[PDB]
Structure formats: C-alpha cells, structure tokens
DNA sequence: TTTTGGCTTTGCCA
C-alpha cells in the first residue's frame, strides 16, 4: 500500500500538510538529491519526502519555492517532533550546506540503534535492515534505485517509509534493554554535536606545516648522510629487509627489526638510534603532514585553511574515532638534535583572533574504576590532588615523587593501566625491566594493596559469564561470547575485554554526556552565534576531541567565560564517588597550549 | 598465541 502524495502541488494542500505536519509527535524524514559534488537546494537538493506510518510518504519539491522552504524551516527546526532519519549525520550536514535548515530538536538514527543493539557487530545498510528487522516491508525495496538508476523522489519516499518501519522495531528492541532512554538523551546529542564538529572543522595552517616539513626533509637528508658513512655504500632504508641483510646480522645479535628490539641495542653502537630516529621522522612525514597537506579547503568566511574530520563513531566501547587522515593520532612534541622542537600539533590554528581551548579528563578511567570497584585505597587516593601515576613511578624506582620525569610518568601510567587490564607477569618483566618472578610479585603486591579492583575484576568476570555480555556505567551492552569458551586464550582475551570494555565505555559515556551537556549550556549563553562555520564568531565551536579532551575554539573574550563553562560541565557531568578532576588548557595552537589555572 | 580501544602489521594517538 505505498503511496507518495506530493503536497507541493496545491498552496492549500500545502498549508494543510503543515498543519498536520507540526502536530504529529513522530515522523521520519529523507532527502532526494542529484548526481552532484560539494549543496544547492534548487540543483543538488531536489526535495524531502516526510512520513508518518501506514506505508504513506509525502513529498515535498524545492524545484520550480521561498515559502515553501520557509515553511520546511518552521517545521523541521523546533516543531514531541521527533525526526528520524537514516544517517543523522549526513543528512544535517547535507541540510545545512544546501538549505541553511538546522535540525533542531530530538533526532534519531537506526544506526545508532542498530550499534547500540550489538556494537561489535557490522556497520547494516538501510536494506540490510529490512531483511532482519522488519521483513514485512521487503517488497518496498524494489524502489531505493540501484547501481545506475534511481528517481530521487521514489528513492526519498520509500527510505523515509523504510526508516519509519524500522525504527519502530528498533524502539521496542531498545525498551527491553532499558537503552531507549539512554539512546535519546546521549548517543543522539552526541551524533548532533559530532555533526557540529564535522561543519566547524579545525584550523591548519600551512605556513608552519612546511616549515616543520623542510625540517623533517632536512633530517632525513643529514641522517642518510651519516649512516651511510657508517656503512660506506648507498642502501635503501626503508625496506626493513634491507637493514635485516647485513646490517645486525654480524655486527650485533636478537629478524623481527622492530622499535623494541633496537631499543635495547641503543646503549651500543649508535646505528640503531639512527634508524629509530629515521623511522619515526619518516612515518611522520608520510602519516601526517602529506594526508593533512591535501584534504585541506580554504574557508574564506575564516579566510583561513580547515581540515575537516569524518567522525565514525561506530566502535566497540564506544570511543570515538575519525577517517584515515585521523587527527587524533598526530604525534605529540619530540626533539631533533639537528636543538629543534617538532610541534606537529602546533600547525593547528584558530581562527584569527582566537585561542585553542583543551579541557582534559585528570585519570578518567583510573576514577571510572575506582567509582566501579568501590577500592577505598585507590578513591582516597584520588581525592588529595596527588597524581598516581608519579607516586607509583616514586615507589617502583625509589626517587622522590616531586623528583620523577615525565617519561618516567608514563612508564607508570602504562604499568598501571596494563595490570588493571590483565597484563600478564612475562610482559610486566619484559617492559619494567625485572624477571618473569619479580614482576609476578609486583603484580601480587598491586592486587593485595588495591582490595577493590581484584574483586572487580572477578566479579566483573563472573558476571560476564552468568549474563554473557558486560555493561556499562550507562547500560550499554557489549555481547562476548568467548567468556565461557574451552580455549584457554580466547576465555583470557575476554575476560580482559569485559574489564577494558566496562571501565573504557563508562568513560566514554562520560565524555559524550560532558560534550552535550556543554553544547547546551554553550547553546544557552549565545543565542546569537552561529552553530558551527558553515553556517554563517561568539563562543566555541568543538573543533576536535581526543577521547578524553575537547578542543574548543574561541574568542579572546570569551576564552575565560567557556573555560568557566566547559570546566564545570565536566566536572559536573556525572556524580560519583570520586571527584572528576579536569584541567583546561588555552593557547595559541594545539601545540602551544599552556595550563590556564582557574 | 596472554593489557585494550582506534587506525594501519607495527607504531602512533587515546
Ligand atoms: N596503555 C593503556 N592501556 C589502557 N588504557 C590506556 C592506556 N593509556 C591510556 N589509556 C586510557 C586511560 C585514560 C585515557 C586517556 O589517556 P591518557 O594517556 O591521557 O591518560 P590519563 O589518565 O588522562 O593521564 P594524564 O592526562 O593524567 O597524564 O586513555
Ligand atoms: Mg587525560
């Protein structure tokens, strides 16, 4: 019984598809568009097409038009007027760029339903959907076009039915595993405000990109030159096959070259420090300041050069992550004898007259488990302003606390963090120094004085075998079928999936309410900013995040009113038995940022 | 096959 009734045929049959439009408390919208690339609402966007239920779709065309748009307007921004659309992100993006239409209001996505459900799962297609979960609308199907041809109008209304069908299953699905809630009060915001952060894009500039490129080209050029005094032939270095011939196959011994190995090698004869550093300059220069020189567009509102980020926030504990040019992994500052600071992160501008505001979570995960495990040492520990991973690094090694290198902070840190996750007594030696015995007793040592995390761990594994899957702080669920296998590995490695996961997605969640909850007071303060640069420069625009920090951008001005603002939302996102300590740091650049006490 | 998450196996960010 599909039908499609085209309301922008008569102004009276118009006005009263509005009328009964803005009363409805649920519909579900899809966007027809043409062959195209980057939006016009009148050449790329052809119309929308809004449904209701019962198989029946209305189109509404943009072709030949200012008073139906603004009508459009009235209507999708502020109206229940719950939208569902396939690919929120998309299709906000995709309005905003075409029509300057925001969705404003409560969004959903059967995406993020479909993740919710099993997150380690595979990333469905909308036809995917309809096989599974709603197969009564498989005729429908014969109509989403195909691989050559497909009318944009049809193709519109049967995704708008099809998405309306399925995300009316998918709601009872998530109302027996009490995530409905969660799902329409953190995931969608999140959604919207990574859409946000994928319109406001993050400064880059390329002045000093290429200089920290002539540098690295310059290095590279000195560090040939000298290895191949070492060796006193021209060879290649960057096949690992070539350093394994010859090289290290007489002149030293253990060929699995990798950065562990030739680390120990260090103290000796310095050819090993030579390639590390060749190799870790190379990478650089491959990974990072190649992709980032390329997927840069010049924004001339800013008039300015932005990298704009693909979130995919479709992950196992709910990290968010970005598309292969990933600015979460630019490497941090590092030191060239050449002596020269290479600040990668430093070619990360604001906008002009602007200054980068990072707000980081002080140990997230370590206060999730002290919250979760209840451990009394760990939480009273985490409540006098002492920073663990330096008085851990202080016993372990016998220095003063106030005495210890930050190198040496984040040899604990990754010490702590391993045995809290499973890691076993033979890796524990191999990277703290020690004997398989030693590093065993220190483990022992670590789970007799921590009473609380050993006894979350067990239960935790328990519990992961009575229930089969474990959740987090929110109630998301992740399903791990291996916890009750007979093979001795697999049992392991979920067993340690099921602590990671339910600490790593608690501070997840703690992060996406944070970022929501500063979006709405940051919405609250400025009423009259744009939303993002694409838009339409009062307040922050959420230029990036680390999965543990938000970088924000903003104004002279303002920076002190939105570290205020971002300070306090993230201390006050969640009540726990911990305090949530997070420090804000404003600078000119990302990597320039100094501590802004407060 | 014995910290894990993300991207690419090994190294960089979480
Ligand atoms: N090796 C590891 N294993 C497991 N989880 C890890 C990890 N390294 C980091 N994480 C997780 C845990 C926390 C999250 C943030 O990463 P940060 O390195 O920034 O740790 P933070 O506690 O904030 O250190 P601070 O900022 O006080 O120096 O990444
Ligand atoms: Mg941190």
Request: glycine fraction near 6%; hydrophobic fraction near 40%; proline fraction near 4%.
């Given at each position: 019984?599909?039908?499609?009734?085209?309301?922008?045929?008569?102004?009276?049959?118009?006005?009263?598809?509005?009328?009964?439009?803005?009363?409805?408390?649920?519909?579900?919208?899809?966007?027809?568009?043409?062959?195209?690339?980057?939006?016009?609402?009148?050449?790329?966007?052809?119309?929308?097409?809004?449904?209701?239920?019962?198989?029946?779709?209305?189109?509404?065309?943009?072709?030949?038009?200012?008073?139906?748009?603004?009508?459009?307007?009235?209507?999708?921004?502020?109206?229940?007027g719950?939208?569902?659309?396939?690919?929120?992100?998309?299709?906000?993006?995709?309005?905003?760029?075409?029509?300057?239409?925001?969705?404003?209001?409560?969004?959903?996505?059967?995406?993020?339903?479909?993740?919710?459900?099993?997150?380690?799962?595979?990333?469905?297609?909308?036809?995917?959907?309809?096989?599974?979960?709603?197969?009564?609308?498989?005729?429908?199907?014969?109509?989403?076009?195909?691989?050559?041809?497909?009318?944009?109008?049809?193709?519109?209304?049967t995704?708008?039915?099809?998405?309306?069908?399925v995300?009316?299953?998918?709601?009872?699905?998530?109302?027996?595993?009490?995530?409905?809630?969660?799902?329409?009060?953190?995931?969608?915001?999140?959604?919207?405000?990574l859409?946000?952060?994928?319109?406001?894009?993050?400064?880059?500039?390329?002045?000093?990109?290429?200089?920290?490129?002539?540098?690295?080209?310059?290095?590279?050029?000195?560090?040939?030159?000298?290895?191949?005094?070492?060796?006193?032939?021209?060879?290649?270095?960057?096949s690992?096959?070539?350093?394994?011939?010859?090289?290290?196959?007489?002149?030293?011994?253990?060929?699995?070259?990798?950065?562990?190995?030739?680390?120990?090698?260090?103290?000796?004869?310095?050819?090993?420090?030579?390639?590390?550093?060749?190799?870790?300059?190379?990478?650089?220069?491959?990974?990072?300041?190649?992709?980032?020189?390329?997927?840069?567009?010049?924004?001339?509102?800013?008039?300015?050069?932005?990298?704009?980020?693909?979130?995919q926030?479709?992950?196992?504990?709910?990290?968010?992550?970005?598309?292969?040019?990933?600015?979460?992994?630019?490497?941090?500052?590092?030191?060239?004898?050449?002596?020269?600071?290479?600040?990668?992160?430093?070619?990360?501008?604001?906008?002009?007259?602007?200054?980068?505001?990072?707000?980081?979570?002080?140990?997230?995960?370590?206060?999730?488990?002290?919250?979760?495990?209840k451990?009394?040492?760990?939480?009273?520990?985490?409540?006098?302003?002492?920073?663990?991973?330096?008085?851990?690094?202080?016993?372990?090694?016998?220095?003063?606390?106030?005495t210890?290198?930050?190198?040496?902070?984040?040899?604990?840190?990754?010490?702590?963090?391993?045995?809290?996750?499973?890691?076993?007594?033979?890796?524990?030696?191999?990277?703290?120094?020690?004997?398989?015995?030693?590093?065993?007793?220190?483990?022992?040592?670590?789970?007799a004085?921590?009473?609380?995390?050993?006894?979350?761990?067990?239960?935790?594994?328990?519990?992961?075998?009575?229930?089969?899957?474990?959740?987090?702080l929110?109630?998301?669920?992740?399903?791990?079928?291996?916890?009750?296998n007979?093979n001795?590995?697999?049992?392991?490695?979920?067993?340690?999936?099921?602590?990671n996961?339910?600490?790593?997605?608690?501070?997840?969640?703690?992060?996406?309410?944070?970022?929501?909850?500063?979006?709405?007071?940051?919405?609250?303060?400025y009423?009259?900013?744009?939303?993002?640069?694409?838009?339409?420069?009062?307040?922050?625009?959420?230029?990036?995040?680390?999965?543990?920090?938000?970088?924000?951008?903003?104004?002279?001005?303002?920076?002190?009113?939105?570290?205020?603002?971002?300070?306090?939302?993230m201390?006050?996102?969640?009540?726990?038995?911990?305090?949530?300590?997070?420090?804000?740091?404003?600078?000119?650049?990302?990597?320039?940022?100094?501590?802004?006490?407060?």
């Amino acid at each position: 019984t599909f039908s499609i009734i085209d309301v922008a045929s008569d102004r009276r049959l118009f006005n009263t598809f509005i009328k009964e439009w803005k009363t409805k408390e649920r519909y579900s919208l899809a966007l027809a568009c043409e062959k195209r690339e980057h939006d016009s609402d009148g050449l790329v966007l052809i119309g929308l097409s809004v449904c209701w239920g019962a198989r029946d779709s209305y189109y509404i065309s943009l072709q030949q038009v200012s008073e139906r748009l603004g009508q459009v307007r009235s209507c999708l921004s502020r109206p229940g007027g719950v939208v569902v659309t396939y690919d929120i992100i998309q299709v906000y993006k995709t309005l905003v760029l075409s029509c300057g239409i925001s969705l404003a209001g409560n969004c959903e996505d059967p995406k993020v339903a479909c993740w919710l459900l099993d997150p380690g799962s595979e990333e469905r297609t909308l036809p995917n959907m309809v096989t599974v979960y709603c197969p009564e609308e498989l005729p429908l199907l014969d109509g989403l076009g195909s691989a050559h041809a497909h009318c944009p109008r049809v193709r519109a209304a049967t995704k708008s039915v099809l998405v309306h069908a399925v995300m009316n299953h998918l709601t009872g699905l998530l109302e027996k595993d009490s995530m409905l809630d969660l799902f329409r009060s953190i995931e969608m915001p999140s959604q919207v405000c990574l859409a946000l952060l994928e319109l406001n894009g993050v400064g880059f500039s390329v002045e000093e990109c290429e200089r920290q490129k002539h540098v690295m080209q310059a290095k590279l050029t000195a560090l040939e030159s000298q290895a191949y005094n070492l060796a006193g032939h021209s060879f290649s270095l960057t096949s690992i096959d070539d350093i394994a011939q010859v090289l290290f196959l007489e002149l030293h011994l253990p060929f699995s070259t990798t950065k562990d190995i030739l680390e120990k090698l260090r103290p000796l004869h310095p050819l090993p420090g030579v390639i590390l550093e060749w190799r870790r300059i190379t990478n650089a220069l491959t990974k990072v300041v190649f992709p980032l020189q390329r997927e840069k567009q010049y924004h001339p509102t800013l008039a300015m050069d932005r990298i704009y980020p693909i979130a995919q926030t479709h992950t196992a504990t709910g990290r968010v992550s970005f598309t292969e040019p990933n600015i979460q992994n630019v490497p941090k500052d590092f030191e060239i004898c050449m002596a020269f600071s290479v600040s990668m992160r430093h070619a990360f501008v604001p906008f002009s007259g602007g200054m980068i505001l990072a707000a980081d979570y002080s140990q997230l995960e370590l206060r999730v488990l002290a919250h979760l495990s209840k451990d009394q040492r760990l939480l009273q520990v985490l409540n006098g302003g002492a920073d663990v991973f330096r008085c851990i690094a202080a016993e372990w090694k016998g220095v003063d606390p106030e005495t210890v290198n930050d190198s040496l902070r984040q040899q604990a840190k990754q010490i702590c963090y391993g045995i809290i996750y499973g890691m076993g007594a033979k890796s524990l030696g191999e990277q703290m120094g020690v004997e398989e015995n030693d590093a065993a007793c220190y483990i022992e040592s670590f789970k007799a004085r921590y009473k609380g995390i050993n006894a979350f761990l067990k239960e935790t594994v328990k519990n992961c075998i009575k229930n089969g899957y474990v959740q987090t702080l929110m109630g998301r669920r992740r399903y791990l079928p291996g916890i009750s296998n007979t093979n001795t590995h697999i049992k392991a490695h979920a067993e340690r999936q099921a602590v990671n996961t339910t600490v790593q997605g608690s501070a997840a969640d703690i992060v996406k309410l944070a970022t929501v909850n500063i979006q709405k007071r940051l919405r609250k303060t400025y009423p009259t900013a744009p939303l993002s640069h694409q838009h339409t420069l009062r307040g922050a625009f959420f230029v990036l995040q680390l999965h543990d920090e938000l970088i924000y951008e903003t104004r002279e001005e303002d920076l002190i009113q939105v570290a205020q603002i971002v300070k306090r939302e993230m201390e006050s996102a969640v009540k726990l038995y911990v305090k949530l300590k997070a420090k804000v740091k404003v600078g000119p650049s990302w990597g320039n940022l100094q501590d802004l006490d407060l």
